[PDB]
Design a protein around this ligand. Structure first.
Ligand code: NO4
Ligand code: NO4
Lengths: 794, 241, 110, 55, 159
């Protein structure tokens, strides 16, 4: 919503500055987007009349003119605009003037002939950019007057954002009405006198959907001049409100729309077959709009049709051939009220957004159609001429909106606000807003006016009382409530503690978009169909990630393109894997995923430049899993993943539950995405490991311990962690520590076999151990390794 | 092509994580409980004068809880604090109500048994507002004990004496042995304490409380002897990672 | 819970968030779930105001639709974008650079 | 990340006031995202928010 | 429940938490320990020779009679305790006040909060892919640079 300030001050002119008025409009719930002047800054430009215009003797384009500006003599001006005649009233920038851009006007010769000034155009003054010619002023223009006094160019075009509520503030009257209640000043309304019909013609108008169109006013205007010029006062009032001048008929309908908030339309009477039928469209009925595009309408859409075809979308957009063209002479003015629930959504269903639909879907004043119809008729006749027939009134008083009767109790008022507002100040505010207020015992009962559509409950009156009283004049009071601790569980593992650990291990947290390129995601997870986004922001962001690796790997590529090979990052977020048995057909689990690459460290004088390998990432994961205290119950099993190298990939199990993956990206997938080298990735389901073991103290042995080493030779395919878990499970009465300190493959052991060097630490709380039971317990573990792994001792 | 197959079950390349002392874990828990209640954490020196540790708490020089307090002294004025009171006395003098603080720290007494150590940690809370009542002291303490042990356990409030509170009380939780077990002390702040810090007991009131950290840690994690905390056996501390 | 509580809480929040006794204004707005509604602005060094917070007293139709009585209970809600409050707090120019994840940009927030 | 620093700061601000942090899914239906907030189907908030719709 | 106002506290983003520093040390392989404030002066006088410390006239023991001038006396005493129990590699730290007599400080004694630690033994425990090397100077400084990097002032640090 854009409007002129001088137009607003014609209804209410408070004794405040423009910016003081803008902030006052902002504090009323109408955020101002900007306050811009109507034209550029300049001085020395005046009105003038060309007295003589002749051909330039040495320039076929130019014209030698003599212009009078009320001075002692006539000024010689050279101009090359095509619309430069002799009976014209122009805007003259005399000598000494300066235009936007510090364009000083000095006397000079133009192709030989003298010129003592310049004839201006709208673009040369910063008004608009209509550079088709120079300015054509009305014949009544006072000669010696400055252009800023005649055109009122000391004005500002205020732009405001009007929320879906406050539907009344979409016209000059609506904003001026609310500016009046903040200053407690009366509202000056122009005298809108009915015109009174002078001819007899009409046409049958029947509405078959009274619930959608409670009121429809039609009026025929016979014999008008469509090509009549729009007066300048109306061209500027429309231009200062963000509406260009088109034709004299549509400029009148746009003027009353901006002045009163009432949308209006004009048909060609001679192209209307039979009459007007305000009806719901047939399901599938097509209609050609003014822009040439066709619309296959639904039965939900209200249309203005005749007895044969459809002519327009009810209160949204006008048709192509049903409108006013360049040879029509008799028009039919539509001015109606449509139920907002019958107009909302239909425009966006067809990608339309008009001045009409935006106001009908929010609600226009149902006591306004007649006042606007009489103004449009008077303004149309005084511009295009003609004779107006009678007003066709098709009103259903039943389906009209009812003014609600709301009761406002003093109890809820000071409860929702917390600040006492005097009852004298409450009753005035509600009355100035147009409510019929009935005072009572600690209570009010107001009837919302006809133009308000957001007043339906008691709380709506609280917002109105408070916003007029001023939010900046309500004090602050800290909440007095209960101090209750809540539920804490020591067994919980904080995600922030895990991110802290990864920060202390050399990882940087990143955040990637949830929707990813399905081309890249299909390379990482082939054959899995992802949830797709119809009408997305982009096709490279049109697939809900089923893992965080697509965004992580895309991030390491983004940083490797900036001369940064070494990237250690991690992310936490939800994955979206489709599932029938999941709520909404999609299971959203919180995942923890990361990726490392490059050298293990940055270049250091005492640290070897080696590429990160598998055991570097696992060591970071074992540090994460060590927080849960369940690291003794974690197993890494080599399982196939299409995105991971088959020989260096691992599934992460916790007491039988696989909680994620860890491994190096497959070298073929590494060739794609052009990863600069070997990269390690992992992913973890957070809700599976977000619970830690609460400690319970055990008695420490006061007696010394004994360590024994064993050399166990097994097949190379035998996982070494399962041998350690067998030594620690067999020996539980005495074996308190099982650690592997060397793995040997080569000369001394047959090919396909390896020797594991394992240290056993034995200790008891009640005595000191001796070699009798020490060798017996060690032999108990050696035999257990031979029954499960066919192991041996070397 | 090439099969660089490795065993993924070998221990990873890492340094084993360290842990916090079991007293610190308990202290950080209670701070997180009262943190969500508006209780700021306050710290102060471990060496105090007789004013901030005795006199300002309605404990004159002749009072028994002073010489018979197992107190370490340096002069006739300087001493090792027996309570984190010097930091609460100083806060009440710097600001007016409302106050809502907890003051953890080390305190020193002169006994050394299985149940006593010459040094130990103490957590002392304090809240001073307008309508602070004894019903509030029961509520915020039953809330704490229910959450510290994560159990709806049996508690009881028992009359006691503290020179800086009246009404005074100690609370017990139903020990796992059938008998009661003293956990913490508390009480409404004494009007003489508020008087010499610039607070009028006619306008404001409040309650304070105190508890031993080694006490609640032995109950929570099942620690047998109290000397285990300060021996710092790595095998002992590695259980609280 | 009243509008005076909503103003005092967010005034404490904004001042502690920017660590500065800064100027703040409450202006009415609209949200289908609050009435009265408001938006909270702060004045940056650029001279103009900057909207950061949206807030309002919870609408009675929402309290109704969950099992709460608006005649018995009340309360306010608020909402804010973290990227906008991060840019003002740390001086971040282009908002898109949060999700580019340039390590040269993330290293500044150690 | 610079925005998680902000979230963790705000949580510690409202943590000292009794505000318990709650989390939930990102793919919601129409009731928990619009209807339960007094935003019916004909309300323009379903389009002025500019929403990604799966179905 | 207590009925009181919900007013936020004083928060300074420029503050570094001692819990954040303790947590970082835990992630670098350090175990927190707590020792007594009074130590043996005969052991403290060979660690800090010629530095007269505040003594207890009537202590529980002469081995616990001198308020510590630094945390090294209690830390190194804890190292020997664990080493006498077949634990060669210890990596511990402690936070606590020190007690240094200062006539310009309150009560003639200054009590500043310290952060001290000590490491020994091999860098790692016996690992199948890590070589047994004893810890050197640049290992402990590396952990200190990680602690100092939390302040964003490491570029303004000299050794
Ligand atoms: C109280 C204190 C001093 C002691 N701390 C509280 C406590 C209460 C009951 C048992 C033990 C400890 C600080 C000044 C105000 C009143
Ligand atoms: C659900 C909600 C969440 C809607 N978003 C929060 C918000 C509030 C006020 C201004 C801006 C944003 C609001 C309260 C009832 C239950």
């Amino acid at each position: 919503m854009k409007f002129s300030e001088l137009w607003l001050r014609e209804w209410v002119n408070p004794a405040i500055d423009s910016d003081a008025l803008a902030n006052q409009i902002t504090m009323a719930g109408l955020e101002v987007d900007g306050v811009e002047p109507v034209a550029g800054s300049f001085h020395g430009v005046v009105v003038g009349e060309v007295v003589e215009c002749a051909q330039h003797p040495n320039a076929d384009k130019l014209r030698v003119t003599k212009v009078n500006v009320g001075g002692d003599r006539l000024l010689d001006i050279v101009c090359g605009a095509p619309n430069c005649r002799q009976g014209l009233r122009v805007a003259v920038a005399t000598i000494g003037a300066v235009l936007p851009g510090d364009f000083k006007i000095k006397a000079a010769k133009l192709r030989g002939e003298p010129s003592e000034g310049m004839l201006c155009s709208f673009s040369e003054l910063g008004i608009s950019d209509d550079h088709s010619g120079i300015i054509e002023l009305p014949a009544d223009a006072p000669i010696g007057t400055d252009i800023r006094e005649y055109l009122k160019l000391d004005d500002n075009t205020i732009e405001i954002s009007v929320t879906p509520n406050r539907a009344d503030c979409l016209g000059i009257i609506g904003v001026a009405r609310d500016v009046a209640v903040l200053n407690q000043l009366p509202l000056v309304q122009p005298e809108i006198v009915p015109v009174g019909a002078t001819i007899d013609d009409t046409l049958p108008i029947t509405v078959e959907a009274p619930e959608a169109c409670p009121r429809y006013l039609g009026r025929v205007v016979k014999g008008i001049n469509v090509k009549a010029p729009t007066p300048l006062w109306m061209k500027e009032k429309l231009r200062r409100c963000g509406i260009r001048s088109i034709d004299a008929v549509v400029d009148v309908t746009n003027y009353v729309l901006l002045e009163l908030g009432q949308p209006m339309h004009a048909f060609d009477k001679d192209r209307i077959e039979g009459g007007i039928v305000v009806r719901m469209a047939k399901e599938g009925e097509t209609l050609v709009l003014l822009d040439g595009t066709e619309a296959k309408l639904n039965a939900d859409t209200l249309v203005i049709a005749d007895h044969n075809k459809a002519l327009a979308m009810g209160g949204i957009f006008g048709g192509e051939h049903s409108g006013v063209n360049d040879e029509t002479q008799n028009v039919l003015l539509e001015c109606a009220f449509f139920s907002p629930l019958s107009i909302t959504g239909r425009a966006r269903r067809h990608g339309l957004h008009t001045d009409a639909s935006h106001r009908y879907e929010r609600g226009v004043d149902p006591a306004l159609q007649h006042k606007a119809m009489e103004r449009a008729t008077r303004l149309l006749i005084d511009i295009c001429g003609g004779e107006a027939g009678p007003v066709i009134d098709i009103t259903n008083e039943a389906t009209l909106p009812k003014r609600a009767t709301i009761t406002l109790r003093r109890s809820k008022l000071d409860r929702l606000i917390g600040h006492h507002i005097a009852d004298e100040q409450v009753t005035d505010i509600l009355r100035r807003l147009g409510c019929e207020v009935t005072e009572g015992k600690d209570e009010w009962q107001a009837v919302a006016p006809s133009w308000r559509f957001d007043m339906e409950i008691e709380e709506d009156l609280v917002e109105e009382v408070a916003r007029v009283y001023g939010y900046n004049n309500i004090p602050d009071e800290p909440v007095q409530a209960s101090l209750i601790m809540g539920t804490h569980r020591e067994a919980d593992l904080s995600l922030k503690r895990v991110k802290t650990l990864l920060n202390d291990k050399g990882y940087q947290e990143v955040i990637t978009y949830s929707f990813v390129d399905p081309k890249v995601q299909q390379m990482i997870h082939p054959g899995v169909e992802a949830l797709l986004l119809p009408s997305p922001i982009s096709v490279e962001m049109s697939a809900m990630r089923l893992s965080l690796w697509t965004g992580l790997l895309a991030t390491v590529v983004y940083n490797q393109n900036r001369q940064q090979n070494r990237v250690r990052i991690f992310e936490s977020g939800l994955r979206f894997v489709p599932d029938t048995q999941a709520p909404l057909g999609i299971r959203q689990d919180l995942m923890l995923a990361g990726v490392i690459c490059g050298n293990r460290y940055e270049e250091h004088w005492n640290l070897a430049k080696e590429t990160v390998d598998f055991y570097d990432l696992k060591g970071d994961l074992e540090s994460v899993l060590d927080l849960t205290g369940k690291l003794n119950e974690v197993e890494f099993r080599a399982e196939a993943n299409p995105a991971l190298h088959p020989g260096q990939s691992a599934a992460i199990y916790l007491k039988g539950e696989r909680i994620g993956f860890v491994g190096v990206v497959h070298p073929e997938l590494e060739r794609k995405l052009d990863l600069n080298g070997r990269t390690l990735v992992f992913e973890l389901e957070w809700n599976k490991l977000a619970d830690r073991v609460v400690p319970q103290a055990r008695e420490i042995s006061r007696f010394p311990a004994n360590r024994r080493d064993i050399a166990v030779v097994v097949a190379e395919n035998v996982p070494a962690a399962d041998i350690l878990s067998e030594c620690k499970k067999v020996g539980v009465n005495q074996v308190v520590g099982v650690n592997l300190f060397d793995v040997y493959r080569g000369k001394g052991v047959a090919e396909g076999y390896k020797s594991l060097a394992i240290s056993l630490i034995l200790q008891d709380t009640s005595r000191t151990l001796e070699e009798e039971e020490i060798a017996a317990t060690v032999a108990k573990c050696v035999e257990a390794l031979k029954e499960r792994f066919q192991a041996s001792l070397r | 092509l090439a099969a660089e197959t490795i065993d993924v079950s070998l221990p990873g390349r890492r340094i084993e994580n360290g842990g916090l002392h079991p007293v610190t874990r308990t202290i950080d828990r209670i701070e997180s409980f009262f943190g969500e209640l508006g209780f700021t954490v306050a710290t102060g020196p471990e060496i105090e004068d007789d004013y901030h540790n005795f006199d300002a708490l309605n404990i004159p020089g002749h009072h028994p809880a002073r010489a018979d307090h197992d107190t370490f002294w340096f002069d006739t004025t300087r001493l090792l604090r027996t309570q984190t009171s010097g930091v609460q006395i100083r806060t009440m003098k710097a600001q007016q109500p409302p106050i809502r603080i907890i003051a953890p720290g080390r305190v020193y007494r002169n006994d050394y048994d299985q149940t006593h150590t010459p040094m130990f940690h103490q957590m002392e809370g304090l809240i001073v507002d307008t309508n602070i009542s004894f019903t509030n002291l029961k509520g915020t303490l039953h809330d704490f004990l229910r959450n510290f042990f994560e159990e709806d356990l049996q508690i009881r409030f028992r009359p006691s004496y503290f020179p800086f509170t009246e009404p005074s009380a100690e609370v017990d939780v139903m020990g796992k042995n059938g008998k009661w077990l003293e956990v913490l002390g508390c009480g409404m702040v004494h009007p003489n304490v508020l008087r010499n810090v610039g607070i009028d007991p006619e306008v404001y009131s409040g309650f304070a409380f105190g508890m031993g950290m080694e006490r609640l840690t032995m109950l929570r994690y099942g620690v047998t002897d109290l000397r285990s905390f300060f021996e710092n056996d790595l095998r002992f501390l590695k259980q609280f990672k």
